[PDB]
Amino acid sequence: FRKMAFPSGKVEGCMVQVTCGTTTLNGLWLDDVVYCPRHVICTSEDMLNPNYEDLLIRKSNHNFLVQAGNVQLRVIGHSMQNCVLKLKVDTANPKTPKYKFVRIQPGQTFSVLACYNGSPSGVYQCAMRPNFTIKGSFLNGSCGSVGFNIDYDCVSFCYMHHMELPTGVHAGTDLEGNFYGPFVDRQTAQAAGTDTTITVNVLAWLYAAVINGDRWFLNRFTTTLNDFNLVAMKYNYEPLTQDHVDILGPLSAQTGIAVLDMCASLKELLQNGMNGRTILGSALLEDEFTPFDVVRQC
Amino acid sequence: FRKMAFPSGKVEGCMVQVTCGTTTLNGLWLDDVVYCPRHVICTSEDMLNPNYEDLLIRKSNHNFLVQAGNVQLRVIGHSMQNCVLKLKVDTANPKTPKYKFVRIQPGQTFSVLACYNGSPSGVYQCAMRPNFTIKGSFLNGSCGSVGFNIDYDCVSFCYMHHMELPTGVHAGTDLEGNFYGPFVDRQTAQAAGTDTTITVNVLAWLYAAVINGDRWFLNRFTTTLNDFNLVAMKYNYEPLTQDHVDILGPLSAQTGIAVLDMCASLKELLQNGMNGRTILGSALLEDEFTPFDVVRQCS
Ligand SMILES: Cn1cnc(Cn2c(=O)nc(Nc3cc4cn(C)nc4cc3Cl)n(Cc3cc(F)c(F)cc3F)c2=O)n1
Ligand SMILES: Cn1cnc(Cn2c(=O)nc(Nc3cc4cn(C)nc4cc3Cl)n(Cc3cc(F)c(F)cc3F)c2=O)n1
């Protein structure tokens, strides 16, 4: 059991570089439109406090350099949709996959294709945090990198990377250009709210632990859903809903461990700690696998 | 720090399915050759102790079903090299990247593209353990999945998955079909061998922690490599090689911390424990990030 991303090839074939002045970042090329963060229209003067409609009106198509590898694509139109810029180009992307734009919920996971100057460099899994940040791996030049899931040949893009907060966590938008979380596309210090732990994911990963032979944390205690929720809340864990319990059923049935029983084991983990021990090789409770992630991998 | 894989696209375009009778697994299509585990020529009652020479002589090109999705690639030649089959097909793969075949050492990491029936399903980072196994994530149908690194536009293939051992770890070969470790391609319980901690990578992780301003564990001492190696073994850590010292060069230069001084620091952590303290947020020392991996994530 390891963190596992979707194969990135369908997204690699869409990554380009977008430049405006000395400002450069990554864009997503689908059919005849390139999508990228609007921040690219900022000179370093603008970055601190942009008025974007103002900066945009003062721009022309020829102010946009789009490169796809070696070839420069010519911009025939531009528009802004929230924090996303859309550049119409004269040429369709022959590698466009079947795709959708979706907005994800906290707790859900996705694969991130980190890219620099329109070149893919790495792929990994992240979760949307309850506080709407993501704990990614991103360096200068990563702006515009995207996150996605794949289902039967369809790429559902759900994230476009914008910025890193002071704490080192990451903030960005969906592909309609709306931020996840209370952030703005301005170069100013922004804090996120207090984060909480994705309880249903921890339960899923506990079930992974059992499928993979790691069982030391199971107990014979039991608990009601409400009494587990009281303890979870006390520990800044998200509450567990009946929907979450239902979604855990296939894992429960697989291992023969009732959901409320796995809740009782987790309760004890919260109250006692792991007493030096590990689960699935981790000293910490892991909350970035979903029940689907677990099922798919197991 | 996160475990990060290379983007998988260049390898996704090389994945095929190979089937002999009803036995089926994944193959790798580069130019006009498909490479796959020779295990594919075993029927069920061959799997336990195959005679691969014997099984192969009975084979013709027309026994091999190779498919790129639903498209069949006609086989026009076949041969066996150590534990891999090579099938010459009549079409050069237009998605072939620039590539090489490499044999890695323990400690080196690589991306694995897990595949089922020729269809890629996931990608993740693995390190080669000192006992020549990997701690992968693989189900039934994953045989023939490959591990790789990408350096610029060149894919270096280093691993072809064969089998899961009784403890749940994985064993396979390089792309010349030579197993990593004492294993054989027979469906027989084989035990891994006692594993050890990858010292070179723990050192890289300590350098990473220094780069990030986390440096309490830096002590005031130095060591010879021999002394360090002798102590290392008493704590089930791997001894360092000359090549290890060399691959730590960039990190040593970036931090100003001589390799042997960092060895002295690690030695104290071995002999004294962590004093209820952490490094990069953690009480456990990470041994699956190579010096290259750390440089990649920090700069
Ligand atoms: C360490 N890190 C982690 N993720 C990121 C992502 N990221 C980034 O890549 N770039 C940013 N600013 C830019 C600077 C440029 C310099 N040139 C020559 N071109 C540049 C283009 C960009 Cl986008 N930022 C900062 C940032 C980006 C935004 F989109 C935003 F709204 C506010 C911000 F403060 C950044 O975080 N870096
Ligand atoms: C749980 N797990 C993790 N990795 C693996 C890999 N793996 C695999 O995928 N297949 C194997 N045997 C086969 C059975 C087949 C049944 N049909 C219809 N077709 C089959 C093809 C294969 Cl390869 N094995 C076992 C195995 C494979 C080898 F290549 C070998 F040399 C020894 C072995 F014991 C396997 O481990 N499963």
XYZ file of C-alpha atoms and ligand atoms in Angstrom:
671
model
C 0.000 0.000 0.000
C 1.516 3.351 -1.304
C 0.360 6.739 -2.511
C -0.414 6.231 -6.155
C -1.147 8.798 -8.922
C -3.102 8.340 -12.187
C -0.826 7.814 -15.217
C -0.132 11.395 -16.398
C 0.309 10.975 -20.173
C -3.100 12.353 -21.129
C -2.263 15.588 -19.219
C 1.392 15.784 -20.289
C 0.161 16.074 -23.874
C -1.681 19.309 -22.837
C 0.970 21.279 -21.021
C 2.358 24.515 -22.577
C 4.281 27.600 -21.515
C 2.684 31.013 -21.354
C 4.641 34.256 -21.304
C 3.633 37.894 -21.051
C 6.570 40.300 -20.664
C 9.143 38.713 -18.372
C 6.330 36.909 -16.477
C 6.072 33.172 -17.323
C 4.086 30.066 -16.180
C 2.324 26.878 -17.332
C -0.922 26.595 -19.311
C -3.332 23.854 -20.223
C -4.013 23.366 -23.911
C -7.298 21.701 -24.767
C -8.787 21.853 -28.305
C -8.196 25.442 -29.387
C -8.029 27.148 -25.968
C -5.096 27.577 -23.536
C -6.116 27.973 -19.805
C -3.662 29.449 -17.351
C -3.551 31.557 -14.186
C -4.351 35.240 -14.948
C -1.423 36.197 -12.684
C 0.785 35.875 -15.859
C -0.428 39.307 -16.976
C 1.295 40.848 -13.956
C 4.666 42.603 -14.169
C 6.435 42.263 -10.876
C 5.019 45.713 -10.058
C 1.457 44.423 -10.546
C 1.911 41.222 -8.526
C 1.698 42.860 -5.156
C -1.735 44.359 -5.822
C -3.226 43.724 -9.247
C -6.329 45.208 -10.760
C -6.798 42.464 -13.293
C -9.566 43.881 -15.499
C -7.366 46.966 -15.855
C -4.271 44.979 -16.653
C -6.226 42.873 -19.115
C -7.846 45.703 -21.075
C -4.329 47.088 -21.719
C -3.204 43.828 -23.336
C -3.394 42.554 -26.871
C -3.234 39.061 -28.370
C 0.374 39.671 -29.563
C 1.420 40.303 -25.918
C 0.948 36.520 -25.306
C 3.643 34.022 -26.175
C 2.386 30.465 -26.060
C 5.009 27.701 -26.639
C 4.207 24.034 -27.158
C 7.642 22.475 -26.946
C 9.498 24.122 -29.855
C 6.451 25.582 -31.703
C 4.971 28.985 -30.826
C 1.157 28.960 -31.037
C -0.511 32.224 -32.167
C -3.123 33.721 -29.852
C -6.263 34.833 -31.832
C -8.411 35.895 -28.790
C -8.293 36.210 -25.016
C -10.777 36.444 -22.159
C -10.695 36.147 -18.383
C -12.917 33.815 -16.378
C -12.441 34.624 -12.708
C -8.750 33.865 -11.901
C -8.296 31.877 -15.202
C -7.155 33.406 -18.479
C -8.359 31.758 -21.697
C -6.182 32.215 -24.809
C -7.822 31.095 -28.106
C -5.119 29.900 -30.505
C -5.300 29.122 -34.206
C -4.525 25.378 -33.805
C -6.419 22.538 -32.053
C -4.432 20.247 -29.732
C -4.260 16.863 -31.463
C -3.490 15.247 -28.096
C -6.654 16.662 -26.357
C -8.143 13.867 -24.275
C -11.821 13.354 -23.395
C -12.131 15.783 -20.492
C -14.353 17.552 -17.969
C -13.866 20.463 -15.515
C -15.098 19.512 -12.004
C -14.880 21.241 -8.607
C -13.871 18.853 -5.843
C -14.934 18.656 -2.185
C -12.617 18.673 0.823
C -11.356 15.158 1.493
C -11.291 14.103 -2.174
C -8.001 13.326 -3.802
C -6.389 13.933 -7.163
C -3.189 13.595 -9.085
C -0.963 16.605 -9.639
C 1.328 16.957 -12.646
C 3.953 19.443 -11.436
C 5.420 21.326 -14.445
C 8.071 24.059 -15.024
C 8.111 26.215 -18.237
C 5.514 24.016 -19.860
C 7.565 20.837 -19.139
C 6.133 18.078 -16.933
C 8.511 17.144 -14.165
C 6.684 14.966 -11.609
C 3.389 13.419 -10.591
C 1.910 12.768 -7.170
C -1.317 12.507 -5.155
C -2.771 15.296 -2.977
C -6.100 15.733 -1.122
C -8.162 18.869 -0.980
C -7.752 19.791 2.792
C -10.808 20.733 4.893
C -9.232 24.235 5.015
C -9.021 24.274 1.146
C -5.274 24.205 0.945
C -3.242 21.309 -0.535
C 0.031 19.884 0.745
C 1.867 19.685 -2.520
C 5.464 19.644 -3.740
C 5.941 22.780 -5.884
C 8.810 25.173 -6.550
C 9.107 28.539 -8.320
C 7.849 28.187 -11.899
C 5.051 25.654 -11.010
C 2.183 28.175 -11.349
C -0.484 26.736 -13.683
C 0.293 23.095 -12.961
C -2.940 21.101 -12.835
C -4.587 18.448 -10.731
C -6.974 15.801 -12.091
C -8.558 12.372 -11.875
C -9.024 9.861 -14.690
C -12.009 7.627 -15.249
C -12.264 5.295 -18.226
C -10.312 7.550 -20.631
C -11.968 10.813 -19.316
C -9.676 13.372 -17.572
C -11.573 15.421 -14.931
C -9.430 18.465 -14.242
C -10.144 19.809 -10.763
C -7.208 22.077 -9.737
C -4.879 24.720 -11.227
C -2.000 25.665 -8.989
C -1.537 29.399 -8.126
C 0.619 29.935 -5.111
C 2.416 28.772 -1.972
C 1.376 30.220 1.417
C 3.963 31.204 4.086
C 3.429 27.859 5.873
C 4.519 26.026 2.687
C 1.000 24.718 1.832
C -0.519 25.473 -1.602
C -3.580 27.307 -2.936
C -5.251 27.351 -6.329
C -8.452 27.308 -8.294
C -10.779 25.096 -10.126
C -10.790 25.387 -13.911
C -13.500 27.958 -13.806
C -10.909 30.141 -11.991
C -12.558 30.096 -8.541
C -10.203 29.598 -5.613
C -10.585 26.777 -3.228
C -10.566 28.570 0.116
C -10.552 32.192 1.192
C -7.468 33.149 -0.915
C -6.782 35.804 -3.571
C -4.359 35.857 -6.540
C -2.254 38.614 -5.068
C 1.361 38.411 -3.873
C 0.612 39.177 -0.190
C 0.939 36.903 2.900
C -2.152 34.784 3.311
C -3.033 32.389 6.127
C -5.458 29.525 5.799
C -7.939 28.585 8.471
C -7.110 25.909 10.993
C -6.929 22.577 9.253
C -8.682 19.423 10.460
C -8.083 15.729 9.697
C -10.150 13.863 7.042
C -11.735 11.218 9.276
C -13.360 8.986 6.605
C -9.916 8.834 4.872
C -8.137 7.784 8.069
C -10.746 5.013 8.465
C -10.187 3.934 4.818
C -6.405 3.803 5.417
C -6.924 1.779 8.621
C -8.836 -0.736 6.458
C -5.876 -0.745 3.985
C -3.684 -1.451 6.980
C -5.731 -4.563 7.785
C -5.926 -5.789 4.180
C -2.128 -5.526 4.163
C -1.684 -7.497 7.431
C -1.077 -4.653 9.946
C -3.604 -5.229 12.798
C -2.078 -4.214 16.094
C -4.445 -1.246 16.531
C -7.730 -3.234 16.393
C -9.621 -3.497 19.664
C -12.843 -5.130 20.965
C -14.244 -1.786 22.221
C -17.263 -0.399 20.473
C -18.906 2.957 20.041
C -21.893 4.678 18.588
C -21.530 6.964 15.653
C -22.376 10.001 17.770
C -19.932 9.150 20.614
C -17.153 8.667 18.060
C -18.053 12.004 16.518
C -17.816 13.789 19.894
C -14.223 12.490 20.307
C -13.309 13.237 16.725
C -14.503 16.842 17.055
C -12.520 17.246 20.271
C -9.395 16.231 18.270
C -10.050 18.486 15.237
C -11.180 15.554 13.100
C -13.968 16.143 10.606
C -17.222 14.566 11.567
C -18.099 11.178 10.047
C -21.466 11.095 8.292
C -23.795 8.171 7.661
C -22.903 8.634 4.020
C -19.239 8.088 4.960
C -20.135 4.916 6.893
C -22.053 3.640 3.794
C -19.094 4.464 1.545
C -16.862 2.407 3.866
C -19.178 -0.652 3.576
C -17.310 -2.454 0.836
C -14.090 -2.178 2.903
C -15.943 -3.239 6.051
C -17.443 -6.291 4.295
C -14.029 -7.174 2.810
C -12.255 -7.281 6.150
C -15.262 -8.275 8.269
C -14.708 -5.264 10.530
C -17.793 -3.176 11.171
C -17.302 0.522 10.501
C -18.225 1.505 14.078
C -15.643 -0.946 15.296
C -12.897 0.629 13.178
C -14.154 3.940 14.702
C -13.580 2.526 18.169
C -9.993 1.582 17.186
C -9.373 5.087 15.820
C -10.858 6.645 18.978
C -8.252 4.798 21.037
C -5.488 5.838 18.638
C -6.588 9.479 19.175
C -6.642 9.152 22.956
C -3.526 6.999 23.439
C -1.160 7.713 20.539
C 0.663 4.978 18.656
C 3.085 4.273 21.543
C 6.105 4.247 19.229
C 4.505 1.854 16.744
C 3.709 2.455 13.042
C 0.910 1.699 10.632
C 1.655 0.838 7.019
C 5.144 2.209 7.786
C 3.886 5.575 9.097
C 4.336 7.137 12.550
C 1.324 9.416 11.855
C -2.321 8.785 10.959
C -2.633 9.240 7.243
C -5.712 11.036 5.856
C -5.026 11.458 2.124
C -6.412 8.187 0.878
C -10.132 8.040 0.143
C -12.260 4.835 0.404
C -12.210 4.725 -3.490
C -8.390 5.129 -3.503
C -8.105 2.227 -1.068
C -10.585 -0.044 -2.971
C -8.907 0.676 -6.327
C -5.506 -0.139 -4.996
C -6.450 -3.250 -2.996
C 8.851 16.390 1.092
C 6.654 14.075 -0.930
C 7.427 10.906 -2.850
C 7.132 12.081 -6.501
C 7.094 9.935 -9.631
C 8.303 10.958 -13.086
C 5.493 11.802 -15.510
C 4.526 8.388 -16.977
C 3.458 9.295 -20.568
C 6.618 8.211 -22.348
C 6.220 4.750 -20.767
C 2.424 4.576 -21.116
C 2.955 4.707 -24.899
C 5.151 1.516 -24.725
C 2.814 -0.720 -22.659
C 1.364 -3.794 -24.389
C -0.316 -7.077 -23.349
C 1.307 -10.489 -24.116
C -0.649 -13.719 -23.990
C 0.435 -17.318 -24.448
C -2.547 -19.679 -24.368
C -4.334 -18.257 -21.458
C -1.295 -16.918 -19.573
C -1.182 -13.146 -19.888
C 0.940 -10.272 -18.568
C 2.400 -6.901 -19.575
C 5.092 -6.259 -22.161
C 7.216 -3.241 -23.123
C 7.231 -2.164 -26.852
C 10.346 -0.226 -27.908
C 11.108 0.098 -31.616
C 10.148 -3.292 -33.209
C 10.696 -5.449 -30.110
C 8.386 -6.392 -27.198
C 10.140 -7.301 -23.936
C 8.275 -9.264 -21.259
C 8.818 -11.876 -18.537
C 9.517 -15.354 -20.016
C 7.040 -16.658 -17.388
C 4.339 -15.931 -19.943
C 5.197 -19.218 -21.764
C 4.240 -21.270 -18.659
C 0.845 -22.923 -18.542
C -0.420 -23.348 -14.953
C 1.334 -26.695 -14.492
C 4.584 -25.263 -15.756
C 4.679 -22.365 -13.253
C 6.148 -24.353 -10.300
C 9.317 -25.491 -11.991
C 9.304 -24.604 -15.657
C 11.817 -25.916 -18.095
C 12.043 -22.715 -20.078
C 14.349 -24.143 -22.780
C 11.874 -26.960 -23.333
C 8.822 -24.686 -23.232
C 10.457 -22.308 -25.661
C 11.469 -24.901 -28.324
C 7.835 -25.920 -28.674
C 6.965 -22.232 -29.406
C 6.489 -20.521 -32.714
C 5.902 -16.836 -33.484
C 2.239 -17.628 -34.148
C 1.703 -18.800 -30.528
C 2.308 -15.274 -29.146
C -0.603 -12.805 -28.903
C 0.727 -9.244 -28.445
C -1.843 -6.432 -28.279
C -1.591 -2.669 -28.012
C -5.058 -2.028 -26.552
C -7.260 -4.040 -28.969
C -4.808 -3.884 -31.862
C -2.740 -7.042 -32.427
C 0.992 -6.715 -33.316
C 2.151 -9.673 -35.413
C 5.183 -11.428 -33.972
C 7.926 -12.283 -36.534
C 10.745 -13.461 -34.292
C 11.306 -14.511 -30.689
C 14.200 -15.213 -28.334
C 14.914 -15.498 -24.646
C 17.612 -13.541 -22.843
C 18.073 -14.578 -19.191
C 14.536 -14.162 -17.742
C 12.996 -12.014 -20.422
C 11.349 -12.862 -23.684
C 12.009 -10.648 -26.709
C 9.351 -10.670 -29.389
C 10.186 -9.029 -32.708
C 6.998 -7.540 -34.199
C 6.382 -6.153 -37.642
C 5.750 -2.520 -36.502
C 8.236 -0.105 -34.913
C 6.402 1.669 -32.046
C 5.915 5.274 -33.135
C 5.735 6.359 -29.441
C 9.200 4.895 -28.644
C 11.046 7.467 -26.535
C 14.773 7.932 -26.328
C 15.683 5.107 -23.905
C 18.293 2.945 -22.310
C 18.372 -0.129 -20.180
C 20.137 0.274 -16.851
C 20.813 -2.001 -13.865
C 20.405 -0.063 -10.600
C 21.986 -0.470 -7.124
C 20.113 -0.816 -3.794
C 19.096 2.616 -2.558
C 18.353 4.009 -6.024
C 14.783 4.988 -6.568
C 12.569 4.738 -9.700
C 8.989 5.306 -10.824
C 6.814 2.206 -11.361
C 3.958 2.302 -13.818
C 1.574 -0.435 -12.566
C -0.308 -2.059 -15.422
C -3.038 -4.669 -15.824
C -3.721 -6.395 -19.153
C -1.472 -3.930 -20.909
C -3.379 -0.961 -19.522
C -1.625 1.490 -17.220
C -3.425 2.065 -13.906
C -1.063 3.921 -11.562
C 2.315 5.437 -10.948
C 4.425 5.581 -7.780
C 8.044 5.815 -6.499
C 9.905 2.778 -5.186
C 13.384 2.277 -3.835
C 15.449 -0.877 -4.416
C 16.003 -2.410 -0.916
C 19.438 -3.751 0.111
C 17.961 -7.275 0.033
C 17.043 -6.649 -3.715
C 13.352 -6.501 -3.201
C 11.019 -3.529 -3.651
C 8.167 -2.450 -1.419
C 5.743 -2.027 -4.205
C 2.052 -2.036 -4.640
C 1.032 -4.687 -7.130
C -1.978 -6.934 -7.737
C -2.595 -10.061 -9.857
C -1.998 -9.180 -13.507
C 0.831 -6.713 -12.850
C 3.710 -9.016 -14.038
C 5.780 -7.207 -16.677
C 5.086 -3.672 -15.290
C 8.283 -1.618 -15.478
C 10.215 0.767 -13.308
C 12.123 3.707 -14.767
C 13.769 7.110 -14.411
C 13.638 9.963 -16.906
C 16.690 12.188 -17.451
C 15.642 14.959 -19.838
C 13.853 13.158 -22.635
C 15.603 9.813 -22.055
C 13.846 6.983 -20.253
C 16.224 4.685 -18.389
C 14.346 1.419 -17.764
C 15.660 -0.374 -14.636
C 13.034 -2.845 -13.451
C 10.588 -5.357 -14.905
C 8.202 -6.788 -12.281
C 7.980 -10.624 -12.009
C 6.548 -11.696 -8.690
C 5.364 -11.080 -5.133
C 7.201 -12.935 -2.335
C 5.323 -14.484 0.721
C 6.027 -11.328 2.838
C 4.273 -9.109 0.316
C 7.410 -7.481 -1.171
C 8.238 -7.692 -4.916
C 11.027 -9.166 -6.984
C 11.981 -8.719 -10.585
C 14.685 -8.219 -13.169
C 16.481 -5.585 -15.121
C 15.496 -5.251 -18.836
C 18.175 -7.742 -19.763
C 16.269 -10.276 -17.680
C 18.796 -10.607 -14.805
C 17.075 -10.742 -11.472
C 17.901 -8.311 -8.685
C 18.827 -10.623 -5.858
C 19.039 -14.369 -5.474
C 15.596 -14.991 -7.012
C 14.431 -17.308 -9.827
C 11.303 -17.107 -11.975
C 9.500 -20.124 -10.511
C 6.274 -20.097 -8.608
C 7.852 -21.300 -5.409
C 8.038 -19.598 -1.959
C 11.318 -17.676 -1.928
C 12.270 -15.605 1.144
C 13.691 -12.125 0.690
C 16.766 -12.097 2.964
C 17.124 -9.815 6.023
C 16.821 -6.153 4.968
C 18.937 -3.224 6.169
C 18.548 0.573 6.191
C 19.856 2.502 3.160
C 22.561 4.604 4.798
C 23.290 6.812 1.787
C 19.673 7.909 1.605
C 19.367 8.532 5.351
C 22.399 10.798 4.937
C 20.670 12.576 2.014
C 17.607 13.069 4.271
C 19.851 14.593 6.974
C 21.280 16.981 4.325
C 17.708 17.828 3.360
C 16.920 18.693 6.949
C 20.018 20.949 7.097
C 19.024 22.699 3.852
C 15.687 23.458 5.600
C 17.267 24.902 8.720
C 16.689 21.840 10.887
C 20.138 21.079 12.220
C 20.259 20.247 15.957
C 21.645 16.732 15.295
C 24.824 18.089 13.803
C 27.388 17.108 16.405
C 30.974 18.282 16.903
C 32.771 15.128 15.706
C 34.133 13.443 12.488
C 34.871 9.757 11.553
C 36.729 7.689 9.007
C 34.549 5.872 6.489
C 35.846 2.513 7.784
C 34.957 3.294 11.387
C 31.543 4.484 10.358
C 30.908 1.378 8.225
C 31.856 -0.915 11.084
C 29.449 0.855 13.437
C 26.705 1.051 10.780
C 26.580 -2.730 10.434
C 25.954 -3.180 14.213
C 22.749 -1.195 13.763
C 21.600 -2.977 10.581
C 22.526 0.011 8.384
C 24.253 -0.560 5.030
C 27.973 0.212 4.747
C 28.834 3.159 2.494
C 30.578 2.675 -0.809
C 32.950 5.058 -2.558
C 30.100 5.751 -5.051
C 27.822 6.704 -2.148
C 30.335 9.237 -0.894
C 30.472 10.645 -4.402
C 26.670 10.976 -4.892
C 26.513 12.922 -1.586
C 29.022 15.451 -3.129
C 26.440 18.070 -4.375
C 24.609 18.117 -0.976
C 27.870 18.262 0.938
C 28.935 21.237 -1.274
C 25.555 22.995 -0.939
C 25.577 22.772 2.893
C 29.340 23.000 3.663
C 28.967 19.770 5.782
C 31.698 17.241 4.876
C 30.296 13.768 4.135
C 32.367 12.214 6.992
C 31.062 14.846 9.460
C 27.530 14.020 8.487
C 28.527 10.331 9.032
C 29.735 11.247 12.542
C 26.339 12.914 13.144
C 24.396 9.870 11.978
C 26.623 7.605 14.119
C 25.596 9.541 17.235
C 21.911 9.236 16.328
C 22.506 5.447 15.939
C 24.237 5.120 19.298
C 21.990 7.468 21.325
C 18.583 7.531 19.661
C 16.580 10.675 18.944
C 16.102 11.912 22.568
C 12.326 12.219 21.895
C 12.978 14.711 19.161
C 12.284 14.982 15.511
C 13.985 15.733 12.191
C 11.880 17.291 9.419
C 8.821 16.732 11.660
C 9.609 13.057 12.291
C 10.992 10.609 14.817
C 11.767 8.093 12.058
C 14.659 8.609 9.589
C 13.581 8.279 5.923
C 15.706 5.954 3.737
C 13.818 6.113 0.335
C 14.930 9.561 -0.929
C 18.234 9.473 -2.847
C 20.649 12.408 -2.904
C 19.205 13.207 -6.382
C 15.618 13.087 -5.028
C 16.467 15.538 -2.253
C 18.141 17.965 -4.676
C 15.003 17.717 -6.944
C 12.667 18.661 -4.128
C 14.746 21.379 -2.527
C 16.079 23.173 -5.671
C 7.648 28.092 -4.207
N 6.371 27.890 -5.015
C 5.444 26.911 -4.836
N 4.475 27.022 -5.716
C 4.824 28.086 -6.400
C 4.059 28.613 -7.376
N 4.253 30.033 -7.718
C 4.929 30.379 -8.886
O 5.313 29.547 -9.593
N 5.027 31.710 -9.224
C 4.640 32.715 -8.554
N 4.866 33.929 -9.073
C 5.487 34.131 -10.281
C 6.757 34.614 -10.418
C 7.388 34.802 -11.647
C 8.616 35.256 -12.063
N 8.652 35.201 -13.410
C 9.845 35.590 -14.242
N 7.539 34.701 -13.875
C 6.744 34.491 -12.817
C 5.425 33.942 -12.719
C 4.856 33.779 -11.523
Cl 3.185 33.104 -11.457
N 4.054 32.524 -7.298
C 3.617 33.586 -6.562
C 2.171 33.924 -6.780
C 1.449 33.365 -7.765
C 0.085 33.580 -8.011
F -0.499 33.036 -8.890
C -0.544 34.559 -7.177
F -1.683 34.826 -7.354
C 0.209 35.146 -6.166
C 1.587 34.839 -5.979
F 2.212 35.388 -5.053
C 3.828 31.096 -6.864
O 3.330 30.860 -5.836
N 5.964 28.634 -5.954
C -0.194 -10.156 -6.095
N 0.825 -9.842 -7.101
C 1.735 -8.761 -7.064
N 2.533 -8.853 -8.099
C 2.056 -9.946 -8.750
C 2.594 -10.360 -9.964
N 2.292 -11.575 -10.449
C 1.457 -11.724 -11.577
O 0.920 -10.802 -12.038
N 1.300 -13.043 -12.079
C 1.836 -14.104 -11.668
N 1.531 -15.271 -12.286
C 0.722 -15.332 -13.286
C -0.562 -15.860 -13.229
C -1.424 -15.872 -14.296
C -2.744 -16.344 -14.566
N -3.026 -15.997 -15.826
C -4.195 -16.258 -16.514
N -2.000 -15.357 -16.384
C -1.040 -15.255 -15.475
C 0.234 -14.644 -15.544
C 1.053 -14.664 -14.510
Cl 2.634 -13.948 -14.655
N 2.654 -14.076 -10.514
C 3.348 -15.176 -10.003
C 4.752 -15.364 -10.619
C 5.237 -14.636 -11.701
C 6.483 -14.775 -12.280
F 6.835 -14.134 -13.227
C 7.336 -15.802 -11.739
F 8.498 -16.001 -12.227
C 6.879 -16.508 -10.642
C 5.587 -16.327 -10.111
F 5.204 -17.037 -9.134
C 2.916 -12.741 -9.920
O 3.646 -12.686 -9.000
N 1.007 -10.493 -8.170
